[PDB]
A paper describes a structure:
One of the β-glucosidases from Pyrococcus furiosus (BGLPf) is found to be a hyperthermophilic tetrameric enzyme that can degrade cellooligosaccharides. Cellulase systems consist of three categories of cellulase that catalyze the conversion of cellulose into glucose: endoglucanases (EGs), cellobiohydrolases (CBHs) and β-glucosidases (BGLs). BGL (BGLPf, family 1) isolated from Pyrococcus furiosus exhibits high hydrolytic activity towards cellooligosaccharides at high temperature. The structure of BGLPf shows a stable homotetrameric structure forming 222 point-group symmetry.
Author numbering: 2 to 449
Amino acid sequence: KFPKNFMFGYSWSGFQFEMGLPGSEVESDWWVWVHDKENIASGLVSGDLPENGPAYWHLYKQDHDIAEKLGMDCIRGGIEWARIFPKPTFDVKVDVEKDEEGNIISVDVPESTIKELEKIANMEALEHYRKIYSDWKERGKTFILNLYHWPLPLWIHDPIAVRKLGPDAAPAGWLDEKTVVEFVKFAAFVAYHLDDLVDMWSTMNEPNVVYNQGYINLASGFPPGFLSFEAAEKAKFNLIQAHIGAYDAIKEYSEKSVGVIYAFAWHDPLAEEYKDEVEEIRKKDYEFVTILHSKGKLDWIGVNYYSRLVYGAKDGHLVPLPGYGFMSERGGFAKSGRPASDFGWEMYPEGLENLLKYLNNAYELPMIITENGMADAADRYRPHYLVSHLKAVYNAMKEGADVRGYLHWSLTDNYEWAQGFRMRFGLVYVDFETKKRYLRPSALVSVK
């Protein structure tokens, strides 16, 4: 048994879910990126398109109904910046204070600025977000809103251009210090308008995945797809600012818990001799969260756990080894003998149990499993994945970890970014031609 107040649910993100029937469609850096001819042709993206997705924007009522009757009481979803401000906000001026080193101290966004923003915002789309959030909230359920889930406005980031001409030649995204301010406006705008429907906030989702995959692991098919550690560091730095600033903006219009949602790989030493060196890596990997903790800008943490990384020696440097964790064979078995998801991600509930105790000891904050699931078209392993991983959470809690819920990823199949639709994470299958929902048997583990 889990505590009386422990929430069960799921999570969705705008890009992967909203689009699917005409009307839905929204220009963003990511959109352009998955439509780019060069990218599709070179195999760097699936060539699947998000406008062929599950169409949640229209079909949210059914999905909610399904989740409800599956006993779910909490959803964590998003709102898409590029959907709310298709047109730039730069001309709506705000007073911004900076120190010597070039840090952000404040960004005043009064009620009047919100009104000036209403003029150029898509209030049509905002109203639709209300309908969607209300549909769930008025059922007497909990909702968590996450402000950023990767796509940016085209007027913020043009990844094609950035890649061909370099960041000085186009809207550079999280490389332009300007982008942080505009995001802050966005945060305040959203707080002001939607707080009545939100129980808890998250400034952003997996920002570590964004800066690392976009500017270092080119193989990932993330934008803008060019190699530079300096770029990565800079993007990381501005994402930290964006969080801090958005935290202050939400607080100025809401009295609720604000946190962040983060990609927590569990790191494991192949051999006992590396144990120390691997803990050093844990620190570096989670540093993003460590930082925000130390500035007092985290009321809670969104844990997103899937698999692990195993480190060993190669030609003298210590690196993450193939055949383990996220680097296992797709639809096969890791070296450990654990099976892997269709994404080639090892099944490793142990990691989550270890992780939660690590994060509780390190931060002593309230946590929610804001993402946990697997790509399994066949529902071959999902049922065990679920039950094993819930057991892992339950164990961590017994040893003192403060965990207030679990949100699976996800209710329905959706658009797994550069991998298209071949990665299906849903407890509910979706026929992307008919947009029809059919539950996988694993969905009934949840009816409990």
